[PDB]
């Protein structure tokens, strides 16, 4: 379906689907889920992949788009660079301040993901091995101590 | 008119039936108990449970009434006698349908006025304007469902030659139109893992008169009158098929 | 003339169940249909009642077509083994049939007195026996003022006294002008009551006529049983040389199987030689004529012990 | 910004204690000395339309009894009323009526704050996006807010990255979030009242915090929202009548971990508790689930036991018996069926809800235990109400 | 003797059903039982069959007690309406009954060729007519070597040919020493094959004996008709000299009823003058004797056009 | 012996019924499906034991009551009962032959169903020990045949009393509805509405008045599993009787009803 591919721009009153908080107030990449009805919007990429791993939303025909941080500044991402989340490069373990969960920084290229693994000591991975236990471990190692 | 002359005999013979009286008494007792349980704990939960009870039992009463209307008269030898009278094959079927429909209307009136009286006696501060409208729609839809399965029994009785096979075909009709259709619809929903067309399911919900009764009593891209027109069509097409089967037998 | 069949030939597909039947029932006559080989009795029965149509022929019942609404109001029919609605009473069933036939309800209880169902008229017919169900099926058949009756086995399960009274009622209705067709598989019992017979073979019509005409057409022997006129052995020899059989029974009984063509001379000597005080002379009855007329169209006789 | 001593400083006692008399004043004011000002009824400190009304940068300030009115609304400039710097220490504001469109009481680093018993009734205008915070606590330690009264604000008692403070007796009405916590380690809130708030108590990414005795009357969306919180304790809360706005959930557990949820009371909501798939193995025992349309929502096939130390929860729709007379039911309670999971997975089955085949399927599940999927059952449920003092 | 019922006064409690019935059946007799009012015939049926124990007197069947296996392996019983097992075939039912009676299985073939069921021995009983089920009931009745048959309406629904052949087989069986009891309500039809008749009314046995002794005991008018008589005007009055009433119904169908004491002079009058065609010497049949013996026990003729 | 002749007739008569063949095929395929579900969910042994017990409880009284609802009242109105009474037979011989034939049909259906389920379990689950499987399934066939004979004797009692086949069918339907569904719902309502405060000692002893609960108490002796898998039969743990008393009670349920059927058939004329 071609009506499930267009990314909707973020407004100033858009609320997250899970936390309910104002989305355009926190830094870091955001997340969007476009199925054939209206769009679900998330304030963080780690709050989205948490929504995606639920058994209710897994069997849906929703397209997931994530902000591209290789062509954008971390402080204020722009809606022009919205890449497909299933083909994306997620680096975790960095000390960058996110919004809700782990600091999953998203990219589309090899070199910037390798860099953000380099001078922050994180690990780069793909979409399909994102798990609940890895998300909780990353959140504990980032927001614990 | 001979239609009333056959309908009076059908009224007497149906009112002197032991199985119909037992099933109608159990239906009235269950309706009073459901009204008691709904009043002790309001309106739309009791309406939904009574709709489930009516969907369970009213095909059973309508098939118990008329599974031997044509084949049972043929085995008794009075069918050959009645055709020598100044009578038609349409008039016999129409008189039997009128008599059995009056029996079913009396049964739902007793077993539903009892529940309405129990609801009005037990629960106070519920007034009468919404109750009369909801119960009137409820008994009218129950009579229409009973007439649908009456016409189904008239279809199935004329085809068979022995009374024992008519009971098995009536049991198969009761099983297929109540349990099997919704179970295979649910199995088609599960096995197609959610990419089934959402505009197609409410329009294949119109192919079974039991869910038309539920969609009437649960108020859906369809309007609120095409359900009534579909129920009247389910009466009329099956009555025409029963007449066409009866006119070509023997 | 009620029932004026003029050459019907009913065919249920390729084979013809009824072939070239020419029946002509009179007014105020009694006809008896007999036959078992083919389905010619049942097809002509449905042709008279209007439950069937002739493929090639004409049927005229009471002058008009057999399916007219005015013909069927003056027709009576007693079918085979009919059981009525078992939860209704004996009077409600007759009221229902009188309302369907367009008769008067004031006749109904009179019919309930006429067929002898006066005491059991307020009980359900599921408690009825076979005889009272036959009486109820007769009482619905005499509803209104019928002009033609079709009874199939009317005296099955009835008492012998009720059988005799039923045949007296049949003759009383015949004297007024009605015409009755009785079907029976028992030929002794209707033989003294029918005015005409009709034997049907496998799709064909063998012989129609009175019993005198059938006995004249069929060269059938006469059976004489005597108990000691003068002697068995003295009367054994006289019929043998003239062309008649004399059965050698045990003692004090003479059985004569004679030709009934020369018996007018023969019985004068039997009168002149002894007393007629214990004798019985039987003409060839309906069973012997039925046996001859179905032997004439095939159907060879069985073995010594058979059927 | 004129100093606070520009107004007439009549001095009652000689420990840097002043007493501002009644009357109206104008403009912003600043306290830079360790002063103990105590106003009188009628001392209105109404500014024009802008600026922080009472900027406090001084240790040991015991300002008490003002009638501050109409401060600013520029949130990026933090146009508060009682802006308190980290340079100030031991602030002891108390018992002052407050009306304005901006932040109510903003502290941004002060240790041992004692905001006690203030009425911070905000303006009924704006779309609640820019209403401001009554009692904003940013990077605070050792604070204690007591008996406050916040009304008509945006996400009012907002705690941001605070290690240790106490919340008690705060009545919160007509706000978006009742108490919002973000990154608050070792926290505690006791006996709070929340009425007509959009999501009530939101707890997001905190750890080792104690939530005890707080009430929530006539909320919407969610009663208590639990998001990424760990090693917590939810004991003695009372969530009542959460209406739709979501469908209405008394407790919403999302991406959480080994917490303790005991002795609560979730009543008259469309959903008693919604447990997400990622949050499992929490100690849940002793709660009361009365009057709900659906008690537990757990859309998974992994089994979960909801009774620790042999004692379970109280369920209003539980039909059981206790022949041993020990207080605990003699049969386990299954809150969910397979048809409920089919309805949660595929919403089109909502069309096939009143069908006789649905009741046939439920009877088949009851008669044949092979087709039953593992769920959220608890062995030994209670027979009587464990919490009665929460019902008052 | 086969049946030696002596002094049985069987009661159903406070009322008396049978009252002092003394019936002695010989060997080779085809004695029939007639009666419609009361349960006198049916209680006698269950008394001979051993289904009922007599309250008084003694029933002796084949010399021994009527509930012994040695007399129940030598007894054949054909009931009125037997449905049998519709799922079994014709061979399996007869094999089951032959195994129950202890007969030989090869006879199961021969009896199935003896009545009518050689062609339809493989079809199920649900595809059988009434006559076919009567053939099957006769086939199980003739199992083994029976010495006493107790048939109850053996020719209901049967063929007009198979009725004659069944009575021929019954005559063959009575020519070998077996004794048959026929119960039927169709009195015309069994009167030519029985040797004795027993009429029961109100529980009592009104008359027993042969068909000649019954006519000798019961003074009844002889119903002679001389059809095709040459002259009728003096035939109206020439028979009334000795008390024989001469009543005519057609051109020549006059039924002269005699007094059964002047049979020589009436035949002399008929034969000396006037030439006949077919004289029917209608002796008082079983129907008229039954009517007379029910009238003697207490009964009234029904009105005209009744029952 | 004439008992074997009556049984040989009754076997070939009952094996030609098509409703019996359809219901026995349904029982076999449902047992195979329940065994496959247990093998897929496998430790889930008490769940499939309880499911097989519930399936046999719902289906085998139906098979017995479908066989024997017209054993006596169908012979009397068919005209062959008086004919058989004129044959060299008694009435106990007829009743015993009918019971033996219908019991052989019941045992054949039970053996087919619980052989198909055992074969499916043996072929599906690898490494299954035969020492538990053979013992549990042999207990299943023996107790299922005993329950079928119980309802055979019930059908004989209900058929020897009435004089019409429609009333026999109605009484068979009432007997099937009463012992399977109505008794358990009555016990559940008595337990729930009184909260276990209505004669706590006598209440487990009322399970011996229903053979369909003695059957499940027999078959749930080895593998109890969890307390939620029985419902009202968790009251059966309070019974102080040993395991053989339930077998003796099932045999008594056969014997008392068979003696009552013999008395009714002897009195009936
Ligand atoms: Cu937040
Ligand atoms: Mg307990
Ligand atoms: Zn979020």
Swiss-Prot record, chain A:
Main location: membrane
Membrane topology: Lipid-anchor
Gene Ontology MF terms in the entry: metal ion binding
Compartment list: Cell membrane
Keyword Phosphoprotein: no
Keywords assigned by UniProt, alphabetized: Cell membrane, Chaperone, Copper, Lipoprotein, Membrane, Metal-binding, Palmitate, Signal
Gene Ontology cellular component terms for the protein in this record: plasma membrane
Family, similarity comment: Belongs to the NosL family.
Known role: May act as a metallochaperone involved in nitrous oxide reductase assembly. Specifically binds Cu(+).
Subunit annotation: Monomer.
Protein name according to UniProt: Copper-binding lipoprotein NosL
The organism of origin for this protein: Stutzerimonas stutzeri
Lineage: Bacteria, Pseudomonadati, Pseudomonadota, Gammaproteobacteria, Pseudomonadales
Full protein stretch here: 30 to 174 of 190
From Swiss-Prot, chain B:
Quaternary data: The complex may be composed of an ATP-binding protein (NosF), a transmembrane protein (NosY) and a solute-binding protein (NosD).
Domain of life from the UniProt record: Bacteria
Organism lineage string: Bacteria, Pseudomonadati, Pseudomonadota, Gammaproteobacteria, Pseudomonadales
Its membrane topology: Multi-pass membrane protein
Pfam families: ABC2_membrane_2
Functional note: Required for the assembly of the copper chromophores of nitrous oxide reductase. Could be part of the ABC transporter complex NosDFY.
Subcellular locations according to the entry: Cell inner membrane
Keyword annotations from UniProtKB, A to Z: Cell inner membrane, Cell membrane, Membrane, Transmembrane, Transmembrane helix, Transport
Induction: Induced in response to denitrifying conditions. Activation requires NosR and DnrD regulators.
Protein name as annotated: Probable ABC transporter permease protein NosY
The species this protein was found in: Stutzerimonas stutzeri
Transmembrane segments annotated in the record for this chain: 19-39, 47-67, 103-123, 138-158, 171-191, 226-246
Entries under InterPro entries matching the protein: ABC2_NosY/YtrC-like (IPR032688)
Cellular-component GO terms for this entry: plasma membrane
Example GO molecular function: ABC-type transporter activity
Swiss-Prot record, chains C, E:
Main location: membrane
Any single Gene Ontology cellular-component annotation: plasma membrane
One term of GO molecular function: ATP binding
Regulation: Inhibited by AMP-PNP. Partially inhibited by N-ethylmaleimide, orthovanadate and NaN(3).
Keyword terms, alphabetized: ATP-binding, Cell inner membrane, Cell membrane, Hydrolase, Membrane, Nucleotide-binding, Transport
Keyword Aminoacyl-tRNA synthetase: no
Entry membrane topology: Peripheral membrane protein
Pfam families to which the protein is assigned, alphabetical: ABC_tran
Binding site for ATP: 35-42
Cited InterPro entries: AAA+_ATPase (IPR003593), ABC_transporter-like_ATP-bd (IPR003439), ABC_transporter-like_CS (IPR017871), ABC_Transporter_VariousFunc (IPR051782), P-loop_NTPase (IPR027417)
Subcellular localization, as worded in the UniProt entry: Cell inner membrane
Induction: Induced in response to denitrifying conditions. Activation requires NosR and DnrD regulators.
pH curve summary: Optimum pH is 8.0-8.5.
Sequence ranges assigned to domain ABC transporter in this UniProt record: 3-227
Record family assignment: Belongs to the ABC transporter superfamily.
Cited function: Required for the assembly of the copper chromophores of nitrous oxide reductase. Has ATPase activity. Could be part of the ABC transporter complex NosDFY.
The protein's assembly and partners: The complex may be composed of an ATP-binding protein (NosF), a transmembrane protein (NosY) and a solute-binding protein (NosD).
Protein name: Probable ABC transporter ATP-binding protein NosF
Biological classification of the source: Bacteria, Pseudomonadati, Pseudomonadota, Gammaproteobacteria, Pseudomonadales
From Swiss-Prot, chain D:
UniProt cross-references to SUPFAM superfamilies, sorted A to Z: Pectin lyase-like
Location in or out of the cell: Periplasm
Gene3D superfamilies: Single-stranded right-handed beta-helix, Pectin lyase-like
Keywords recorded for this protein, A-Z: Periplasm, Repeat, Signal
One annotated Gene Ontology cellular component of this protein: periplasmic space
InterPro entries hit by this protein: Carb-bd_sugar_hydrolysis-dom, NosD_copper_fam, NosD_dom, Para_beta_helix_rpt-2, PbH1, Pectin_lyas_fold, Pectin_lyase_fold/virulence
Keyword Repeat: yes
Keyword Nucleus attached: no
Pfam families found in the cross-reference section: NosD
Stated induction or repression of this protein's expression: Induced in response to denitrifying conditions. Activation requires NosR and DnrD regulators.
Per-repeat ranges for PbH1: 58-86, 88-109, 110-139, 140-161, 162-183, 206-228, 256-277, 279-317
UniProt function note: Required for the assembly of the copper chromophores of nitrous oxide reductase. Could be part of the ABC transporter complex NosDFY.
Protein family membership: Belongs to the NosD family.
Subunit annotation: The complex may be composed of an ATP-binding protein (NosF), a transmembrane protein (NosY) and a solute-binding protein (NosD).
Record protein name field: Probable ABC transporter binding protein NosD
Organism: Stutzerimonas stutzeri
Gene designation: nosD
